Design a protein around this ligand. Structure first.
Ligand code: 054
Length: 563
């Protein structure tokens, strides 16, 4: 069947759209080549529609069926709870898209009578009605990139009332089932330090390792109605409350398998027969589907001792080599099996014999040295996209701050420490906003974080070595330096000068600012301050941070204020 059918109505914006980076003094201090930075808009939506619209041909075999049964036997150990309305309302982001039924995200979080009444009625409708397709809105996503232009990605989501009901029925399932099924292969259970540890240990556990990343082109579009029903068959192995079992059954048939598409003007836009990017099950379902297809394909290809690391559609495979010619033919057989399963590649996969040459979740393992000179492995990436997005976020207030999420996840990197920490701490200190909570996302979930709490968060996610790394690899240094020339970012010597200045001001303020000065900026001086475990680090409640993926799932994980 076709992934989409279109009526001809356009994918429309709901307000004015900006595509060009503004010429602003604060963003210009970071990045001077503003014309290289752009944001996608609904103007390129038709280009994206063409790429995501195609017929799927799926052929399943015995390897696929055997893997499915093994996955279902693991899912059969799970007991999942139904969330109460209050618990589901607390998980709603403060700025989640308002309902078309006269209430918004603030009303949901406050348990307003109108919000609660509508949610109760949507819930009863899922219990009673197993067939009526649920309406979805289709919008073009606004994302920032550097030139060499990508068309806008498309987001498809149901009304706010439906989203709260999805959490009641499935929040506990999507949060616990993936690790029960995939074990150590489920990527979202790891902090960045645990992810590097798993990759390094897996690589070194093989007698002769071979690894590859597998990129599926337009993954959401490759997901069939059969894949979505198979995903439900896994969820159905859980012990569930009867209302949850009915709501999952109704959500699968009325929403997850497909449905009508409506634009921002209320016009009928088309029909979807593939994965919706903006539903609670998107990350869990994509992870399960990608793992199932890859595990079965590994057996069809005769790849030896395949260890997967899966995060939604992102897949990395580490296995036992059989020699270069054998591995090359086995990888082609893996690709042919994935294609039969309706997961064709974007870029054809390449066998790799060095762990540092593999790119997974846009990142690669690199090496630096700690204070004692000991080798430390860490995850880095090309800093182009993070710097272009940090420049945009400096010139325009955006709801989600990728710069903050990049500092958290990429804290040990030369670019996050020297550029991002230096730039944002300087601006925030000058605006007296170091203590102001800002939103960021970790594995798709939204968090409200104060920049002053960064040292203890970094210590927990990466260890104290994140504040002591030096002697970065020449390859890493060259990649950063070349990206700065390309974007017109001032050189690292300038960032070291700016860091010494903000560090002195942070130290002069005492308290939490001085902890930021001491730990975050120790790299900028020869006269190093002594770095001991931060007391607040052991008291940090990071439950929920690295449990599961929630991209498109409309999840908020920061504490709810009492009433
Ligand atoms: N492409 C992907 C990435 C992922 C998982 N994922 C995400 C994510 O946004 O979900 C990261 N991440 C965040 O969780 N918050 C963020 C805020 S701004 C940038 C990120 C970011 O990269 C992230 C960082 C790393 C590390 F390498 F750092 F370990 C590894 C995997 C990561 C799965 C599938 N495709």
């Amino acid at each position: 069947s076709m992934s989409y059918t279109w009526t001809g109505a356009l994918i429309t914006p709901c307000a004015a759209e900006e595509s060009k980076l503004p010429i602003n003094p604060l963003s210009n201090s970071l990045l001077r080549h503003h014309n290289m930075v752009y944001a996608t808009t609904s103007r390129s939506a038709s280009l994206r529609q063409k790429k995501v619209t195609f017929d799927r041909l799926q052929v399943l075999d015995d390897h696929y069926r055997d893997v499915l049964k093994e996955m279902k036997a693991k899912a059969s150990t799970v007991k999942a709870k139904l969330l109460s309305i209050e618990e589901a309302c607390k998980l709603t982001p403060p700025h989640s898209a308002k309902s078309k039924f006269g209430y918004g995200a603030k009303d949901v979080r406050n348990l307003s009578s109108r919000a609660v009444n509508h949610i109760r009625s949507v819930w009863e409708d899922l219990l009673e009605d197993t067939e009526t397709p649920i309406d979805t809105t289709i919008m073009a996503k606004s994302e920032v990139f550097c030139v060499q232009r990508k068309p806008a990605r498309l987001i498809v989501f149901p009304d706010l009332g439906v989203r709260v009901c999805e959490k009641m029925a499935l929040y506990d399932v999507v949060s616990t089932l993936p690790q029960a099924v995939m074990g150590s292969s489920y990527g979202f259970q790891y902090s960045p330090k645990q992810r590097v540890e798993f990759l390094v240990n897996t690589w070194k556990s093989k007698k002769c390792p071979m690894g590859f990343s597998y990129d599926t082109r337009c993954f959401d579009s490759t997901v069939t109605e059969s894949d979505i029903r198979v995903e439900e068959s896994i969820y159905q192995c859980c012990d569930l409350a009867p209302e949850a079992r009915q709501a999952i059954r109704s959500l699968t048939e009325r929403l997850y398998i497909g449905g009508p598409l409506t634009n921002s003007k209320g016009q009928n836009c088309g029909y979807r027969r593939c994965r919706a990017s903006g539903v609670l099950t998107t990350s869990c379902g994509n992870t399960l589907t990608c793992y199932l297809k890859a595990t079965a394909a590994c057996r069809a290809a005769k790849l030896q001792d395949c260890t997967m690391l899966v995060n939604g559609d992102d897949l990395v495979v580490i296995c036992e080599s059989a020699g270069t010619q054998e591995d090359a033919a086995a990888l082609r057989a893996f690709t042919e099996a994935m294609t039969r399963y309706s997961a064709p590649p974007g870029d054809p996969p390449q066998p790799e014999y060095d762990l540092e040459l593999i790119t997974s979740c846009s990142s690669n393992v690199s090496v630096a040295h700690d204070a004692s000179g000991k080798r430390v492995y860490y995850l880095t990436r090309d800093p182009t996209t993070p710097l272009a997005r940090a420049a945009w976020e400096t010139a325009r207030h955006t709801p989600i701050n990728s710069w903050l999420g990049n500092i958290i996840m990429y804290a040990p990197t030369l670019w996050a420490r020297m550029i991002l920490m230096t730039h944002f701490f300087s601006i925030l200190l000058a605006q007296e906003q170091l203590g102001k909570a800002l939103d960021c996302q970790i594995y798709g979930a939204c968090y409200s974080i104060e920049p002053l709490d960064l040292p203890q968060i970094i210590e927990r996610l990466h260890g104290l070595s994140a504040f002591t790394l030096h002697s970065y690899s020449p390859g890493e240094i060259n990649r950063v330096a070349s990206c700065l020339r390309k974007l017109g970012v001032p050189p690292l010597r300038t960032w070291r000068h700016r860091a010494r200045s903000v560090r002195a001001k942070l130290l002069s303020q005492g308290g939490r600012a001085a902890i930021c000065g001491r730990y975050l900026f120790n790299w900028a001086v020869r006269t190093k301050l002594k770095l001991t475990p931060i007391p607040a680090a052991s008291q940090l409640d990071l439950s929920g941070w690295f449990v599961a993926g929630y991209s498109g799932g409309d999840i908020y994980h920061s504490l709810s204020r009492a009433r």
